[PDB]
Amino acid sequence: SGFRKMAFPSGKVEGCMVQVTCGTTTLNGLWLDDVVYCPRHVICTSEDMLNPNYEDLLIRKSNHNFLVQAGNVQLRVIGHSMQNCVLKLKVDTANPKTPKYKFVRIQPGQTFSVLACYNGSPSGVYQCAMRPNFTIKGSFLNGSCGSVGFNIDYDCVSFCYMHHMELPTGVHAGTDLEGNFYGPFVDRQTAQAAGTDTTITVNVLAWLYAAVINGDRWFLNRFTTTLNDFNLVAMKYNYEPLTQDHVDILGPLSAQTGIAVLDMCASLKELLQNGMNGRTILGSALLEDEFTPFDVVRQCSGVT
Amino acid sequence: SGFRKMAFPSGKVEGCMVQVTCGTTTLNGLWLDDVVYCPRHVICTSEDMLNPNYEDLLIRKSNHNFLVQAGNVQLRVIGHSMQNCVLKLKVDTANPKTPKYKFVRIQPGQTFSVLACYNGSPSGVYQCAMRPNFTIKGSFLNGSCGSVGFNIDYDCVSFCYMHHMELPTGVHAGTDLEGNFYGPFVDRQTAQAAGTDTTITVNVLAWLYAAVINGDRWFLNRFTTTLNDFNLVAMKYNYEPLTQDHVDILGPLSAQTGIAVLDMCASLKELLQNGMNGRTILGSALLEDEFTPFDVVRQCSGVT
Ligand SMILES: Cc1c([C@@H](C)C(=O)O)ccc2c1[nH]c1ccc(Cl)cc12
Ligand SMILES: Cc1c([C@@H](C)C(=O)O)ccc2c1[nH]c1ccc(Cl)cc12
């Protein structure tokens, strides 16, 4: 029993973190096989970040200007290329610790673990969700750029995020491992504001199922609802509309607990309308939306 | 910017997890040098757990009855001994991945990372605090016993916890790495109830400092208090009494933000008396107490 905001074990990812320096800028890189991936803004000064012409700035850079250090040993850069907002530095040595891996572009509402790094050294690991406005609420200080987000399926690491920017509002923006930003964000120090940070409804319902499994049942009521009726309330509360696809994904949790998905929606509806009244669910005073239905199943079954 | 419930990178600890089986019971062990540490209740069936005589049950066990598997390779057990509530299995091979390490017995209010494991395989990592009633609120299912809690100081892992029990209330109990339980708990399936789970006041104040540093300042008021006056309110709200030692530990956070420790106590006092009024602090609707002042400094400075 017990339910925690849990990250994946980070060992496989720690073995990939390197330090990348270009001029006076130092950030993190991800070393997989003989390639080091890092934000292309490593070539920028804070002045350049106001209006960077990346192709032009890159003309002045050669392989020897990209200093890559893995632990305390320097890697030899034998090639470099820019793919969207990431630089790929080809090195002469394949990372001996390269895990089985994939590059995946996640959807909003999906969760992942971030290994926050500074100067190629891991400092901590925490769990995130890609928000419906394509920002993440992370913990990133100067030097953390190039830290990556990931999920693990047994022994295969699926890298889904690379940290690039902190918006003036304190939220974070970044790219998948092909260098395409999530959402409308760009790697430029400019006024970039996020849209509405709606709540990931399917995740909140999955977390209400985790709560029932772990003994917190006070919020269960005698009501039911329909998707349309539920969605009128979700709209009013800035919650994502619930679809039949979400109902289907919650199927296994519904089966395990015997609580129909629409009955859990009705409990959620009353919680939205009435609040918590000073009570908590799984030690939280708000409805948690950063556990997917897969995360709840995984944690409630002990997948390794 | 941004402040998250962050765990230490778990790689160094993942390299130490092994599977230990005795008869029909399988749990986790911690392999450091040529020793594997695991809960002594590995020798018990669920029937034995009602009233186990560990010395007597251990007489029927030989080195060859303890099956230790590291990954998919079996380790040879050449000695075994019981130290308090842990078994130490001497193996013929030193763990090649043994990090620099210490065994420390923590105080209530101290935080640590747990690497939840099943069958010697890491499933996830999360941050905990040793509660003032010596329980932890973890996420542990059957098979998770032997999972460990730890902190890291650069390259040295200080192991402070080993998971042994889940109380009927769903909270968790365990030992330090010398096998002494935290608090009054025993490794017996019996009625064991926890005392008052008070709030770790110094941690909540450290987290209010993290909130000010990260821009959440609405709760700051025009008041101050004294330790005695603050403690009258802390007592009423089941908060730990604040001491001059706690005020001293918050010194660096006070200096960095320019908010006197007693002024932050007065903000905390008003939050206790008035509630949050539907507002949040660092995305939480309750006062978080599982960040120590050291954790706040570390996360707000990017220590690796
Ligand atoms: C894989 C790769 C890279 C990486 C960065 C990549 O583009 O994936 C960069 C540069 C080169 C490269 N293969 C080469 C073969 C011939 C020559 Cl002349 C250059 C390169
Ligand atoms: C370190 C150690 C252990 C571990 C479990 C320990 O007690 O720390 C267990 C058993 C033995 C041991 N050294 C030995 C030397 C001679 C003999 Cl006859 C037995 C043992």
Side-chain angles (χ1 to χ4, degrees):
Chain A
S1 198
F3 200 80
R4 276 284 180 176
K5 188 61 77 54
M6 195 180 290
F8 289 94
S10 61
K12 287 170 184 296
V13 178
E14 293 168 48
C16 300
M17 302 311 300
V18 296
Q19 178 193 82
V20 184
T21 300
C22 190
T24 67
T25 303
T26 295
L27 42 62
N28 306 280
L30 181 69
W31 183 21
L32 294 166
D33 304 320
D34 57 350
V35 182
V36 175
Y37 302 83
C38 76
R40 71 179 176 169
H41 80 239
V42 72
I43 73 176
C44 302
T45 64
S46 40
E47 314 83 87
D48 291 333
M49 291 302 291
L50 304 174
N51 188 26
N53 184 308
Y54 286 100
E55 288 290 6
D56 290 346
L57 286 172
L58 201 53
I59 294 166
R60 317 290 160 197
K61 304 303 168 168
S62 299
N63 292 330
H64 67 263
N65 296 124
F66 296 101
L67 307 171
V68 181
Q69 203 181 307
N72 260 322
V73 324
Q74 211 68 24
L75 288 183
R76 188 175 300 275
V77 179
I78 66 173
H80 69 276
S81 65
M82 174 171 63
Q83 178 183 14
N84 304 300
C85 305
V86 295
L87 289 178
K88 294 189 297 191
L89 310 173
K90 192 196 180 177
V91 293
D92 72 352
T93 303
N95 180 359
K97 305 184 187 175
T98 307
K100 295 179 183 176
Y101 73 95
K102 296 182 167 192
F103 289 170
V104 303
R105 185 173 178 84
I106 60 166
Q107 302 294 329
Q110 297 303 114
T111 56
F112 57 93
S113 297
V114 172
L115 179 60
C117 292
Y118 297 92
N119 306 116
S121 292
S123 88
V125 63
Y126 53 90
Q127 194 71 353
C128 270
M130 176 58 52
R131 305 307 311 170
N133 63 3
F134 297 98
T135 66
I136 74 168
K137 298 185 182 128
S139 168
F140 296 104
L141 293 170
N142 293 338
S144 66
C145 297
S147 295
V148 301
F150 63 96
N151 284 272
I152 304 180
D153 198 325
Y154 174 50
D155 65 356
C156 179
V157 186
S158 286
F159 292 102
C160 58
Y161 182 79
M162 178 170 271
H163 187 51
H164 288 241
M165 306 295 292
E166 182 170 82
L167 302 196
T169 57
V171 301
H172 303 107
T175 70
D176 61 24
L177 272 290
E178 300 171 355
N180 293 120
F181 268 85
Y182 283 98
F185 308 110
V186 294
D187 48 355
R188 180 182 177 214
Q189 189 180 324
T190 193
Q192 303 192 73
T196 310
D197 195 355
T198 57
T199 306
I200 308 147
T201 311
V202 71
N203 291 6
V204 174
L205 291 167
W207 172 83
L208 287 177
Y209 277 110
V212 165
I213 290 168
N214 289 278
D216 233 338
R217 318 165 49 94
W218 66 264
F219 56 86
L220 295 180
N221 61 35
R222 310 183 155 274
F223 319 132
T224 199
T225 181
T226 63
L227 269 190
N228 291 152
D229 176 81
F230 175 75
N231 285 336
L232 290 181
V233 181
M235 184 96 85
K236 164 178 158 106
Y237 285 89
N238 296 125
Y239 263 58
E240 282 298 278
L242 197 69
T243 72
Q244 190 56 48
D245 276 3
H246 296 139
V247 173
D248 290 347
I249 295 162
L250 292 160
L253 289 172
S254 180
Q256 199 196 319
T257 65
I259 297 158
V261 172
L262 290 177
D263 295 4
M264 192 68 85
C265 290
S267 288
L268 176 51
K269 174 167 156 203
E270 298 297 310
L271 278 170
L272 290 178
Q273 292 174 342
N274 304 333
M276 308 277 285
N277 287 124
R279 291 175 294 251
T280 61
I281 298 168
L282 291 172
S284 174
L286 48 84
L287 299 163
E288 295 293 329
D289 76 346
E290 299 202 342
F291 296 96
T292 69
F294 296 91
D295 291 338
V296 171
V297 166
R298 183 184 311 114
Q299 186 169 168
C300 295
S301 77
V303 180
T304 64
Chain B
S1 198
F3 200 80
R4 276 284 180 176
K5 188 61 77 54
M6 195 180 290
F8 289 94
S10 61
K12 287 170 184 296
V13 178
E14 293 168 48
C16 300
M17 302 311 300
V18 296
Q19 178 193 82
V20 184
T21 300
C22 190
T24 67
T25 303
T26 295
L27 42 62
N28 306 280
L30 181 69
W31 183 21
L32 294 166
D33 304 320
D34 57 350
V35 182
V36 175
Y37 302 83
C38 76
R40 71 179 176 169
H41 80 239
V42 72
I43 73 176
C44 302
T45 64
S46 40
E47 314 83 87
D48 291 333
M49 291 302 291
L50 304 174
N51 188 26
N53 184 308
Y54 286 100
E55 288 290 6
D56 290 346
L57 286 172
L58 201 53
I59 294 166
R60 317 290 160 197
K61 304 303 168 168
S62 299
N63 292 330
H64 67 263
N65 296 124
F66 296 101
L67 307 171
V68 181
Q69 203 181 307
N72 260 322
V73 324
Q74 211 68 24
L75 288 183
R76 188 175 300 275
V77 179
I78 66 173
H80 69 276
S81 65
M82 174 171 63
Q83 178 183 14
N84 304 300
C85 305
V86 295
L87 289 178
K88 294 189 297 191
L89 310 173
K90 192 196 180 177
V91 293
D92 72 352
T93 303
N95 180 359
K97 305 184 187 175
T98 307
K100 295 179 183 176
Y101 73 95
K102 296 182 167 192
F103 289 170
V104 303
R105 185 173 178 84
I106 60 166
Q107 302 294 329
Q110 297 303 114
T111 56
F112 57 93
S113 297
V114 172
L115 179 60
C117 292
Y118 297 92
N119 306 116
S121 292
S123 88
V125 63
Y126 53 90
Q127 194 71 353
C128 270
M130 176 58 52
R131 305 307 311 170
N133 63 3
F134 297 98
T135 66
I136 74 168
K137 298 185 182 128
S139 168
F140 296 104
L141 293 170
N142 293 338
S144 66
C145 297
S147 295
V148 301
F150 63 96
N151 284 272
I152 304 180
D153 198 325
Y154 174 50
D155 65 356
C156 179
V157 186
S158 286
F159 292 102
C160 58
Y161 182 79
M162 178 170 271
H163 187 51
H164 288 241
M165 306 295 292
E166 182 170 82
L167 302 196
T169 57
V171 301
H172 303 107
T175 70
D176 61 24
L177 272 290
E178 300 171 355
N180 293 120
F181 268 85
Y182 283 98
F185 308 110
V186 294
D187 48 355
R188 180 182 177 214
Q189 189 180 324
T190 193
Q192 302 192 73
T196 310
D197 195 355
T198 57
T199 306
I200 308 147
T201 311
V202 71
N203 291 6
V204 174
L205 291 167
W207 172 83
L208 287 177
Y209 277 110
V212 165
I213 290 168
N214 289 278
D216 233 338
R217 318 165 49 94
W218 66 264
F219 56 86
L220 295 180
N221 61 35
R222 310 183 155 274
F223 319 132
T224 199
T225 181
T226 63
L227 269 190
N228 291 152
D229 176 81
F230 175 75
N231 285 336
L232 290 181
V233 181
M235 184 96 85
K236 164 178 158 106
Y237 285 89
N238 296 125
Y239 263 58
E240 282 298 278
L242 197 69
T243 72
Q244 190 56 48
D245 276 3
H246 296 139
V247 173
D248 290 347
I249 295 162
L250 292 160
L253 289 172
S254 180
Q256 199 196 319
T257 65
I259 297 158
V261 172
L262 290 177
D263 295 4
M264 192 68 85
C265 290
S267 288
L268 176 51
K269 174 167 156 203
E270 298 297 310
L271 278 170
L272 290 178
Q273 292 174 342
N274 304 333
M276 308 277 285
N277 287 124
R279 291 175 294 251
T280 61
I281 298 168
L282 291 172
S284 174
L286 48 84
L287 299 163
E288 295 293 329
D289 76 346
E290 299 202 342
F291 296 96
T292 69
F294 296 91
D295 291 338
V296 171
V297 166
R298 183 184 311 114
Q299 186 169 168
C300 295
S301 77
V303 180
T304 64

